[PDB]
Structure formats: C-alpha cells, structure tokens
Amino acid sequence: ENLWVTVYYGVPVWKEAKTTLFCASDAKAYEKEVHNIWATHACVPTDPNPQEMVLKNVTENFNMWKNDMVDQMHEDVISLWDQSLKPCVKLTPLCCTLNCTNATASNSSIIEGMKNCSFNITTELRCKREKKNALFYKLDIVQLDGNSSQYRLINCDTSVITQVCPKLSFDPIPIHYCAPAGYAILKCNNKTFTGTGPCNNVSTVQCTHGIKPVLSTQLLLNGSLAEGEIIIRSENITKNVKTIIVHLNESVKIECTRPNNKTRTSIRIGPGQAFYATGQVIGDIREAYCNINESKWNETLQRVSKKLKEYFPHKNITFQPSSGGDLEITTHSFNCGGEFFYCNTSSLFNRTYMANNSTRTITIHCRIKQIINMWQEVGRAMYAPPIAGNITCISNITGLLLTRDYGKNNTETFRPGGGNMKDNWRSELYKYKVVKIEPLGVAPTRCKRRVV
Amino acid sequence: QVQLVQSGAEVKKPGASVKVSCQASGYRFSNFVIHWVRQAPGQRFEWMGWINPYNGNKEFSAKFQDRVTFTADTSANTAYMELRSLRSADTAVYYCARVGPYSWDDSPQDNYYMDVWGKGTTVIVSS
Numbered sequence: 083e084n085l086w087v088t089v090y091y092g093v094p095v096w097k098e099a100k101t102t103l104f105c106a107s108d109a110k111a112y113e114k115e116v117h118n119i120w121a122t123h124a125c126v127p128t129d130p131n132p133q134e135m136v137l138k139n140v141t142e143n144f145n146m147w148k149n150d151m152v153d154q155m156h157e158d159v160i161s162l163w164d165q166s167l168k169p170c171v172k173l174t175p176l177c178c179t180l181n182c183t184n185a186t187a188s189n190s191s192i193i194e195g196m197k198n199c200s201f202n203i204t205t206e207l208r209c210k211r212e213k214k215n216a217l218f219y220k221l222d223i224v225q226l227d228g229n230s231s232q233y234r235l236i237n238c239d240t241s242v243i244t245q246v247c248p249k250l251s252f253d254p255i256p257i258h259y260c261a262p263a264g265y266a267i268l269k270c271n272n273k274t275f276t277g278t279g280p281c282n283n284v285s286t287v288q289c290t291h292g293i294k295p296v297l298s299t300q301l302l303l304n305g306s307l308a309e310g311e312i313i314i315r316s317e318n319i320t321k322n323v324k325t326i327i328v329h330l331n332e333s334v335k336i337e338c339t340r341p342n343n344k345t346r347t348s349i350r351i352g353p354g355q356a357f358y359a360t361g362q363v364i365g366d367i368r369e370a371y372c373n374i375n376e377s378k379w380n381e382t383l384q385r386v387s388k389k390l391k392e393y394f395p396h397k398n399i400t401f402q403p404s405s406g407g408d409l410e411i412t413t414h415s416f417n418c419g420g421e422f423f424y425c426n427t428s429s430l431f432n433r434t435y436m437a438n439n440s441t442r443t444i445t446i447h448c449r450i451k452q453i454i455n456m457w458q459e460v461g462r463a464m465y466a467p468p469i470a471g472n473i474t475c476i477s478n479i480t481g482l483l484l485t486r487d488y489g490k491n492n493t494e495t496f497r498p499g500g501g502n503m504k505d506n507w508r509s510e511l512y513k514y515k516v517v518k519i520e521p522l523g524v525a526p527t528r529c530k531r532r533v534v
Numbered sequence: 535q536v537q538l539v540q541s542g543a544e545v546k547k548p549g550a551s552v553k554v555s556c557q558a559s560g561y562r563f564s565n566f567v568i569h570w571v572r573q574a575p576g577q578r579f580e581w582m583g584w585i586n587p588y589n590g591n592k593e594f595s596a597k598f599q600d601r602v603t604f605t606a607d608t609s610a611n612t613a614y615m616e617l618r619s620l621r622s623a624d625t626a627v628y629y630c631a632r633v634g635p636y637s638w639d640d641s642p643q644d645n646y647y648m649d650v651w652g653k654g655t656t657v658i659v660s661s
Contacts, residue, residue: 220641236642240593406635407565408586409642426638449638458589485562499562501588 085526093523100150101265101516105158106258106289111251119166119250120257120295129258129289136285142268146277146512147317151259155511156504159295160457163464170247171355173465175204177238181231185217187363196363197223199233207353214349216359221409222453237453237463245465248358252417252466254304256292261516268515273310277512278318290514293507297456300404300414300427300498302481302509307333314389315512322486325500327509328386329481334379338372338423338475340450341365344468358467360452365472370450372425374479376442379430386482387435394494397437401484402497403428410455411501413448418475421466424449431498458503481509536560538630538652545658548620552657556613556630563611564588569631569648570604570615574623584646585613620659627654 105125111118113128178201185198198217205212225233237243246252261267267290270281296304308331317323347361387399404412404427413424425448456464483506485499541555556568570582583594587606594602598617606613613630634649 222642224642240591404635405562405565407567407588407633408645409636411565411588412636413638447638455589460589460591487562488559499565501564 084528086528086530088525088527088529090523090525092521095523096266096517096519098515099518101261101518103151103154103516104260104262106260108255112255116251117249118255119252120162120255123162123166125257129260132258132291133288134285135287136271140284142270142281142284144268144270144275144278144281144515146315146508146515149511149515151514151516152504152508152511155259155507160459163456166250167244167246167464170244171352171357173238173243173245173357175351176201176357177235177243178202180223180233180235182223182233185363187367190367193363193367195220195367195369197233199223203349203357204351216347216349216361217363218360219450219452221449221451235453237455241461241463243453243463243465245358245467248467252420254294254296256294258289258292259514260289265516265518268517270513273308274313275512276313277315290511293510296416296506297422298414298416298506299411299501300483301416301479302329302483302506303336303416303477303479305478305480306510307331307480312386312389314386314393315509322488325502325505326484326486327481327500327505327512328484329509330382330386330479332382333478333480334375334382336372336374336477336479338370338418338448338477340370340419340421340423340473341368343471346468346470360468370423370425370448372423372446372448372475373443374430374446375440376444377439379444383433384435390496391437395437396492398434398493400434400493400495401431402495403431404498410458411499414446414498416477418477419473420469421450421452421473422454423475424451427498483509536632536650538632538650540630540652540655543656545660546620547661548622548659550620551616551618552620552624553614553616554628554630554655554657556615556652558611558613558632561632563606564608566632567646568604568606568613569629569633569646570602571629571631571648571651572624572626573629574626577626582615587613622659625658627656629654 106129107121107125108128111121180199180201182197182199185193185196187193196217197220200213200215202211203214222236223233224236225231266286269285269287271283271285272281275281294304308329312331313329315327343364345362345364347359349357349359351357390399406412414427415424417423425446427446430446452466454464483500484496487495537559539557544552546552564587567584567586569584571579572582573579581595582598582602583604585592585604585606587608592604601618603616630652631648632650634645634647636645
C-alpha cells in the first residue's frame with residue numbers, strides 16, 4: 083500500500099547505438115596561414131580542453147573490433163580526399179602511348195633507376211598535338227608491344243588518375259572526434275586492456291584526444307604509445323587470427339632522406355591548369371634510405387617476443403620478411419615531406435628466438451613511387467608531383483601490424499601483414515566507443531500531487 | 535610447401551554455366567594475385583584473366599570478358615571462377631595459378647609469371 087509512481091528527467095543511464103560523429107581539428111593548418119587538406123574543410127574550431135571526467139564503480143563492455151565509429155572514420159577519410167581532388171586537373175590526355183629511353187643524369191652516362199619519358203600531348207586546350215619530355219620512376223611505367231617497343235603508364239589504362247592540387251599538403255594533423263548532442267564517449271583508462279570484454283575502470287569525455295591520420299603499412303608511426311607494458315591484441319575466436327596488433331610502450335626513432343636534388347618541369351595540357359612533371363636530376367645520386375637504432379631494436383624484438391610467448395609457450399618463434407605478391411605489401415609504406423616512401427623491410431625482420439645505444443646503425447634501402455593505389459580502391463589512382471631539392475624526414479615508430487602463418491611442427495613463423503587499412507586506425511581507436519543517453523526514468527515513491 | 539587444391543571434375547550442359555573453385559595452402563591467400571588458365575586437348579594454353587584477392591580488381595582477356603567472371607574470399611583461402619554460356623569448344627582442362635614474389639629490383643609486373651599451379655580440373659560440355 084501507498085507505493086506510488088514518480089518520473090525523473092535527465093537520468094544518468096545509456097544504451098549502445100550508432101551515431102554520426104563530428105570532425106574536430108585545428109583552425110588553420112598548424113595554426114599557420116596555409117591550406118591543409120584535413121583542417122581547412124570546416125571541422126569546427128581548435129577545441130583545446132578535453133572534458134575528461136572519471137567514473138566511480140563502473141564496469142563496461144567493449145568491443146573494439148565491432149565498434150561502429152571506425153566505419154565512420156574510414157568513410158570520412160575516404161571522402162575528404164575524394165572531394166578535395168575534384169577541382170584539380172586530371173592526367174587523362176597524357177595516358178596516350180610513350181616512346182622513351184634510359185636517362186643520362188648529370189655527369190653520368192646512365193642512371194639505372196630512371197627512364198627519360200617522351201610523349202605526345204595536347205599543348206593548347208583541345209588541339210595542336212606535339213612532342214614533350216619529362217622523366218618518371220619505373221614503377222609507374224610498363225611495356226610490351228610493337229615491332230619496336232612501346233611504353234605506357236602503369237594505371238591509366240585500368241583507372242583514371244588525378245594529381246593532387248600542388249598547394250595542398252599531405253601532412254597529417256591531430257584531429258579530435260566528438261559525439262553530437264545526446265551521446266557520449268567512453269575510454270578505458272585501464273593501462274592493460276585486451277581490447278574486448280569488460281573494462282574495470284572507465285572515464286568519459288566529449289571529444290577524444292587528437293588522432294593523426296597517418297597513412298602507413300608495416301609499421302605504426304607518428305602514433306600513440308601504450309602507458310603500461312606492450313599490448314598485443316588479436317581476434318578472440320580462434321588461435322589463428324585475422325590480424326595481430328602490437329603496440330609499444332617506448333617509441334623508437336626513424337629518420338629518412340631522399341638525397342638527390344630534383345628540379346621541376348611543368349607541362350601545360352590546360353586552361354588555368356598545369357600537369358606537373360619531373361625534370362632534370364641534380365646531385366650525387368643515391369636511393370632513399372632510412373636509419374634505425376640497432377641495439378634498442380634488439381631489445382624491442384626481445385620484449386615483444388617475450389610476451390608473444392605467454393600466449394604461445396613452446397620453443398620457437400620465427401620474425402621473417404614479407405611473404406610476397408605485388409609490391410604494395412612487401413615494402414614498408416609511408417609518406418613524408420611531399421612523396422610516398424616504400425622500403426624493403428627484409429633486413430630489419432630477420433630474427434629468430436628460442437625458449438628456455440646510438441651506434442652500429444642499421445640502414446634499409448627504400449624505394450619511392452609517384453602513382454599510387456591509395457585507399458586500396460577499385461579503379462582509381464593518385465599522382466604526386468615532385469618536390470624541389472632533397473628531403474629529410476623524422477618520425478617515431480610505435481608498433482607493428484603482424485600476421486601468423488599456418489602452424490607447423492614446434493615452429494611459429496611471424497611476419498608483417500594484416501594489410502587492411504582499417505587496422506591502422508583500429509590499432510589506435512581501440513579505447514573508444516559511442517553511446518546514447520535515455521534521460522527519462524520512472525520509479526515508485528512515497529509522493530503524490532494534490533487533485534485540486 | 536605450397537599447393538593449390540581445386541573442385542571436382544565437371545560435366546555440364548551446353549548453354550549453361552560452369553563454376554570452379556581453387557583453395558590454397560602454405561601461404562597467405564590475400565597476398566598473391568591468382569590466374570586462370572585453360573587448355574583444350576592438344577592445343578595451346580589460353581589466358582583467361584587474373585584477380586588480386588587483396589582488392590578485387592579484375593582484368594579479363596577481351597575475347598572472354600562477356601563470358602567469364604572471377605571472385606575471391608579472404609576468409610575461405612579460395613578463389614572462384616564462373617564461365618557462362620558453355621559451348622563445345624570449352625571442353626578443356628582448367629587451372630588456377632599463383633605468381634612469384636616481388637623483389638626490390640623488379641619493374642612492375644615482372645613477377646606475374648606462373649610460380650605455382652594446381653592439379654587442374656576436367657570440364658566437358660555435354661548433355
């Protein structure tokens with residue numbers, strides 16, 4: 083008797099659901115008066131303060147593998163390039179056929195890395211075919227046919243190519259991501275979370291910390307670090323797994339350079355437009371290369387292998403170089419300055435272990451390409467213009483995207499892989515999730531109104 | 535070791551379709567392009583096309599583009615092919631293939647030579 087309903091508004095409970103999240107970035111590039119492909123497209127202001135707030139006595143489920151807000155991220159990263167490239171002039175007229183030779187570099191009779199390439203092109207808007215010349219990297223060039231030979235670009239037959247507008251910069255910037263009105267974001271302050279299952283310490287925030295859309299395979303660089311020990315995350319259904327993410331607690335320096343000096347040459351296709359071509363080479367010629375501290379890396383491989391063994395307790399672990407296939411997997415990929423570096427990582431992942439510090443620097447040969455299958459997309463490619471002079475680079479390696487082969491007798495063969503671009507960000511957005519508020523609630527109580 | 539294993543032999547009706555599968559082992563299936571090749575009795579091998587499981591881009595011989603279709607699945611370690619509108623000339627032994635690994639010195643598409651094959655499958659067009 084005398085138990086009687088009451089209703090509350092503003093209630094603190096929640097349920098899981100998908101949402102449309104906000105972009106959130108700096109105002110103008112690195113707060114510098116230049117155009118940036120990410121920041122400049124609105125994305126609201128340089129929100130300085132994350133509203134972190136910690137929860138007493140909250141245990142929370144989390145599924146970073148199935149979390150909805152990686153999909154919207156991938157959709158957003160795709161769309162920004164797609165809309166930004168559109169006004170830039172295309173490469174379609176140049177796709178016509180080529181007749182070219184070995185290039186004579188300065189003070190040199192040969193250069194084994196360079197074709198010098200001659201091509202027909204429309205010089206006025208829509209007439210006056212004429213001959214013109216430039217030079218290209220091999221791996222945008224192919225050839226078979228004719229009574230005498232005949233040359234062609236790698237991708238223009240299968241897919242359309244567009245060169246990025248030259249003033250736009252590729253460099254990544256920290257982007258924050260905020261929930262819209264009526265939803266919130268949870269974190270797992272826990273420093274050893276596996277990625278799935280309940281989370282024993284949870285805090286909430288309107289916006290995530292800055293996340294950097296670094297394009298990379300084979301290595302997580304310019305990223306975050308685990309606060310506790312190294313964390314190894316994998317699919318939980320079976321021993322064999324789709325991908326494994328290792329995330330270091332200490333980050334190792336990588337520097338890279340492209341020493342050859344490059345001067346530019348420009349070809350007018352169009353009206354208020356210009357195809358940007360690569361011209362004469364200058365300077366003592368070397369291939370691009372990167373440098374890593376040796377002894378620190380030896381400790382790094384000992385540490386990650388020390389924890390792989392906890393799962394996998396028998397004697398052997400074997401790391402191996404890339405498996406094979408097309409180049410896009412078998413070299414470590416990134417971009418720096420204004421061009422996209424591809425490096426043969428095989429010398430760096432040749433170790434083997436059994437169970438039971440600014441010297442001796444290792445160097446890796448690293449190759450460079452100008453036409454790209456970006457976002458691993460069907461039927462489309464991008465072209466990158468050359469940058470004047472040499473380039474120097476520094477970045478901080480943070481982790482690996484590795485894969486396991488089909489098992490064999492008392493011997494495991496781990497090599498780089500995973501490959502899917504979504505795993506790049508799934509390695510960093512594992513902490514977060516998005517959730518809806520239901521502010522309404524009902525209860526019994528010892529209370530009424532007056533009928534008068 | 536490396537092996538590619540195929541479906542059973544087929545005898546199918548004229549005018550209908552024939553569909554074949556090719557399951558692999560010994561290597562990560564998602565990191566190698568896959569070919570399809572046919573040989574009639576006593577004749578040359580004829581190119582059909584290629585597929586790259588990593589992306590699903592496709593390229594066909596224009597002789598067969600209206601007749602053939604490929605697809606691949608990373609969770610199955612298997613590639614599929616489908617040839618529509620069978621005729622008596624299609625009676626042949628069909629193969630799937632794998633290419634060699636790219637190396638640093640290679641130009642593009644130096645490696646699409648046939649590195650490994652399967653045991654093949656017999657297809658006969660008959661009522």
